[PDB]
């Protein structure tokens, strides 16, 4: 039983390796491992028949469909789901699952104020920036990712071409950024910490 | 009732998302959306007869208005507080209304901590650079904004043309922005949760 | 007595503005500002006769100076300490006093921590970068404001010249720096905390 | 037996202060300070006969050895450890070290959480990039360095070839990161205030 746990890690594992090698430029020794992978997958799925189940269909599905070029993108990144097969044995990824879907609200309030934030400041910049010639920003829609990150303190980047207002309106939009992104994490972090002292 | 506040929010994006649009390069059927747009914020807003209803009010004096070009631009930009008409239907934006009412003595200490360690690192880091030629900031105010970014951990881009006192500076901009960043944030913080959890 | 306070504080904001602007490129107007806002600090001086009557001398010894370019340099930044005769009107700022003094060891604790990281991580990424051609840092002391950057978060700018193993010593600097930053800093925030509701 | 203290910190110091000056590419002087501090740390074990022993221990190893150029840069990198010699004299780096003996489940978890958000948003913005021409990434692989900064914050730098759908993937990744770092660390901030403030 814990060799055949310690086998499914193994292989979950092996299939995460094998996805990204096989987008290494350098390269059947891939589709063997894959299909190897897979069925051990589909073999462990039919001997089990929530979420987990959920993800075990997920993680063969793209096999199967392979056997426009947008669609097929979408289901070869699909195949990325692998991961989420190591949640049936993390325990600490199933309190993460558990924390996500306990501050569903404080999510959805986080990605609000950076919605609002975002469009706020964007459009503030792209007003403080294009009465000039050769503005930065093209339009508002083309503040949205300097916005984001800058609001997330990970930085733009080169932001010489910006003049005294759009600078003064980078310093609001990073002090606005880090209040923020600092008020709806504590109750994400609360629920995390007890869920997790909760099971051990 | 509730259909009345779905519409109102549908209208409320609809105009949002008009905004953000009109200002694209690739663009009267913007106008008479955003005319549309207006007729019912109207129509809402002399029904109705606080901060809610000056944000009602203002969120058709631009277009109002349009019926030197700096007043034009900060017109258009005005425009943008259709985005708080969500206040209304979103608690969560009203909770945070009442977080920055409630800590109003934090962010002024918050603005005064930074404007200070910005005059402060600004001076340091242009003295520290001025000693060399082909100098990196040509004056205190030219360093303002590294000295945010720095503070803030937003990052500044390339610090290669600067020397071993600048980056000695630099080094003690950055701990100190950590710093000081993080002593009002957290009574803020205190504050939003006590409203949402009041609220909640 | 209140409008000698008001008056203090618009001569000390005077003075520093006196200061930026001296140093814009643009730039005996600036003199005749200068010597005021000194006559006055003197006689607010020479009238009330701790850290803050030493923040009152330091404030007119440049000026008194100016009546090798690197002690020129040097006091003309010490010039830069007329910024805090605002303690004596701003009680954040004697809080913020307050906390640093008591939340010594703490600081301490923080630079001894980064001292230990940063040494840690440019020998690591030194190391790492010297058996290629045309390598990123010439030496330990060349890498220690990239491990500056990276555990605070700042950023460091492009890193394309760098290789696998410089990017895995960066990771690893990166989720380091997060936690050093981390550890000492809630103590400080707890001492300000303390300090602020004690005086409120 | 404090002298000897003393003697001993300035020596770690000193041994550390010609290990990065010895990489300075300006330079027996430095060998013969070297075999003087490598005594003196010999002797010092000598007189003595835990980890800290065994980095006593490691702190001479690689002196003698040096009495492929992979193992001699390898071994030329583990004389860095002379640094954590100051943890006998040093209280704050064994309360350091008893905190990360202590959280070592959090982590694990914190690696762990990184590993997966890597994976996930790396194959993301791949798959993402990958259907237009002259694409920013070139594997999967070739994403994690860029979604490991994205995550921590630390930033990227120039993003410019981004497209939108590789924006919108660095703006769910620089949300993930952020929240993912800020789960497991405040249980090792928790568990280093209470080791700090049990030995003071
Ligand atoms: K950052
Ligand atoms: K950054």
């Not at 104020?113 to 920003?137: P, T």
């Amino acid at each position: 039983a814990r060799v055949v746990a310690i086998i499914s890690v193994f292989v979950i594992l092996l299939s995460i390796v094998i996805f990204c090698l096989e987008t290494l430029p350098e390269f059947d020794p891939f589709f063997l491992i894959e299909t190897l992978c897979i069925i051990w997958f589909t073999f462990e799925l039919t001997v089990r028949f929530d979420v987990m189940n959920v993800i075990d269909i997920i993680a063969i599905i793209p096999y199967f469909i392979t056997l426009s070029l947008a669609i097929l993108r979408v289901i070869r990144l699909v195949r990325v789901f692998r991961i989420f097969k190591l949640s049936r044995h993390s325990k600490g990824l199933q309190i993460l699952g558990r924390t996500l879907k306990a501050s569903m609200r404080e999510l959805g309030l986080l990605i609000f104020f950076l919605f609002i934030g975002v469009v706020l400041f964007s459009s503030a910049v792209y007003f403080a920036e294009a009465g000039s010639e050769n503005s930065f920003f093209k339009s508002i829609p083309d503040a949205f990712w300097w916005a984001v990150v800058t609001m997330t303190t990970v930085g733009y980047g080169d932001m010489t071409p910006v003049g005294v207002w759009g600078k003064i309106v980078g310093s609001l939009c990073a002090i606005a950024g880090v209040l923020t992104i600092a008020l709806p994490v504590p109750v994400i972090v609360s629920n995390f910490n007890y869920f997790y002292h909760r099971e051990t």
